[PDB]
Amino acid sequence: AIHTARLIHTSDLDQETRDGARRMVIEAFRFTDDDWDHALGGMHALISHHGALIAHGAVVQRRLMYRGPDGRGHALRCGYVEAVAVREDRRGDGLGTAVLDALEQVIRGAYQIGALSASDIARPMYIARGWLSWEGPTSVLTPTEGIVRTPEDDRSLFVLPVDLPDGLELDTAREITCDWRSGDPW
Amino acid sequence: IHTARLIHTSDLDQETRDGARRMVIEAFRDTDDFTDDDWDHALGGMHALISHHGALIAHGAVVQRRLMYRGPDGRGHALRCGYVEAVAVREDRRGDGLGTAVLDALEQVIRGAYQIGALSASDIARPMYIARGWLSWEGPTSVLTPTEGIVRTPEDDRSLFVLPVDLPDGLELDTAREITCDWRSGDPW
């Protein structure tokens, strides 16, 4: 009766669906070859209608590194949101929130923390769904060098705490560090 | 002829999940005992399950990480890797090909989703994977740490194996070079 996203792992997509998702996200964002590679390897939220894909999103597995005053140091098992895109003539109908619904399901069931990167324009809705704005600096653990701070911008990082270890507590004003990949680390 | 079912961690119900952690800890109770981190590493991607009489008799998982590799031309590849974890067969059910069935499922997930598969196996296991088409890494293995740099991991009786399935178009692997996994807490391989 009402559009919902169905969850499919990358390895269960056939190439005609796989090619449609890449083509659709590229038209909805404009998104390079790397931005699409960052979206492969985990769970896809797909909404299809009238022969075509109308909305898309992905959650892939990374590590988020966090060290508190303790000095302990944690590598959290992270569900990272990628390639959320609603067909242009299909917006304003809640298809976006139906993709986030299915992605958060994945996060809550398989990961210790959700994370995504969003612009100032989009903070209101993410906050309303329970995500937290990360205020502290962000960085990346590079292979060549070590930890390298991510250049400051109007993009914000958001995290969804779901199943953190023993205590961990979590100070969102402290530093947080993602793992390395080429292209955009976030 | 047993076949494995492929289930994502999130689709795992509490029953099916606690049994899997139970079967794997008992199966790997021969090194070190299955720690909390060993199980955490096995969570997050696709599980291959085989069950019988309602009980779980075989398990494996493949989870996504990055493998860092640098060719002679300077390179710099952070390959999208399906890493194999928690391959366990119930002790009384070994011999009937259950492990085969598990890897059958796990290789489908690899070939369908990642640029390379990787696993760590004991010397006694080597033959089973080589006959399946896996390449043995001869080069030194290492791990990228947040505090130190890239540190070698040789104090291990295990051998690294890789399954190239969708390498970036220029890449041809020299299994003689160094290979570096991404950082995680606990056993990095």
Residue numbers in the entry:
A (entry chain B): 14 to 43, 55 to 210
B (entry chain A): 15 to 44, 52 to 210
Paper text:
Three different classes of enzymes are well established: ATP-dependent phosphotransferases (O-phosphorylation, APH), ATP-dependent nucleotidyltransferases (O-nucleotidylation, ANT), and acetyl coenzyme A (CoA)-dependent N-acetyl-transferases (N-acetylation, AAC). Here, we present the crystal structures of an AAC(2′) from M. smegmatis [AAC(2′)-Id] in its apo-form and AAC(2′)-Id complexed with CoA and different aminoglycosides (gentamicin, sisomicin, neomycin, and paromomycin). Collectively, the kinetic results indicate that AAC(2′)-Id has a very broad substrate-binding specificity, similar to AAC(2′)-Ic9. AAC(2′)-Id was not active on streptomycin because the antibiotic does not contain 2′ amino groups in its chemical structure, indicating that AAC(2′)-Id exhibits strict regioselectivity.
The asymmetric unit of the apo-AAC(2′)-Id structure comprises a dimer of dimers. The final model of apo-AAC(2′)-Id contains 742 amino acid residues (dimer of dimer, subunit A: 191 residues, subunit B: 180 residues, subunit C: 184 residues, subunit D: 187 residues), whereby the N-terminal loop region (residues 1–14) and the 45–51 loop region are commonly missing due to weak electron density in all subunit structures. The monomer structure of apo-AAC(2′)-Id has one long β-sheet surrounded by four α-helices. The dimerization of apo-AAC(2′)-Id is achieved by interactions among β1, α2–β2 loop, β3, β4, α3, β7–β8 loop, and β10. Moreover, the dimerization of apo-AAC(2′)-Id was confirmed in solution via analytical ultracentrifugation. Structural comparison between the apo- and the substrate-CoA-bound AAC(2′)-Id structures revealed significant conformational differences in the α1–α2 loop, α4-helix, and β8–β9 loop region between the structures. The α1–α2 loop is the most flexible region in the structure of AAC(2′)-Id and thus misses some residues. This loop may move and cover the substrate-binding site in the apo-structure, whereas it exhibits a more open conformation in the substrate-bound AAC(2′)-Id structures. In the apo-AAC(2′)-Id structure, Arg179 forms a salt bridge with Asp208 and Asp177, as well as hydrogen bonds with the carbonyl oxygen atom of Trp210. The salt bridge, however, is lost in all substrate-bound structures as Arg179 flips away from Asp208 and Asp177.
